[PDB]
Amino acid sequence: TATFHRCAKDPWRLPGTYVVVLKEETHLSQSERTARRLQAQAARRGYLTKILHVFHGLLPGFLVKMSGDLLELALKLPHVDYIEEDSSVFAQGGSLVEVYLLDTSIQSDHREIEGRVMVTDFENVPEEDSKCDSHGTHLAGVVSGRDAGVAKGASMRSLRVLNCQGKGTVSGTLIGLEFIRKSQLVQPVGPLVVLLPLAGGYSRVLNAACQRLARAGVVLVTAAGNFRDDACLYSPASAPEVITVGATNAQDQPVTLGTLGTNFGRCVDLFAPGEDIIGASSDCSTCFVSQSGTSQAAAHVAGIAAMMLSAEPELTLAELRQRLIHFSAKDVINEAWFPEDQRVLTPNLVAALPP
């Protein structure tokens, strides 16, 4: 029957907030009723509950702020597939394509991206424990920047899911991916590229939403993560039908980020430039800064995909992935940087545009 899951990274868990995921074909009316039933049953037991959101489109279910004491009861509700405790996520040509970015707030009026980025009204960020938009402005510059961008012809839509300290939530990200799906149904356009330059621990629900969006025909590009670890233990990096990007440097070496660095393993699809990446600084309207990480690496691939899909708009996700792999530089990465058993498992590929 129905199961409970919470982040395996104890400091990244957010107790007291739960994502109740219902069976695939559960209707929104059934979902709203299940949430009301939960509030009623909890009230009977002396518990105060609050329904924060009701999902529909990608995943059926709701978000509830309640005591964990209520989970045995919540698991017994009808249509419940699984429940997941909320957890933290952290910041880590092309003209026919819309590039969606789920990140920090962005400085839209930056000369590098002015006119190329449409700041949506979406914001779902956890409270905080030039700086607020450093991560997002740089990445938007990497994707479509005037002087230093990959896909200058690409237009972008930005959603805020990371706060001023680059911290978000799984729930926040789910609502953002649902918002993208809703925006597309209301006002369909061409091929969609969704950039996720963030990571948390393995999330069954975040992976599920990512697979639903992927089956719906959306292309999802993510950071492999900066934990010098196997990407399969991180989300949305572990979601199989996503394009999970690792970071390489100018010397064909996997990137070192402090005492850590790029993630690796059978979940990474390929690597891309993620060290000393010049791009837009949000310090001033014409400022540029060098930044590093799998986020930067992912932004390059989001640019290469945005261009491949604009040149060949009918490519399926499966076909686009084979194109990305076919056009990558092969066996240039120093495998000796990776742990021994991870070498045969880690794709030795550096992203590249068709010549």
Partner: peptide, 14 residues
Amino acid sequence: CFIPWNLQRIGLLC
């Protein structure tokens, strides 16, 4: 002409 290493690496020209 100068081109940042990362844009050169992925096949962009200037």
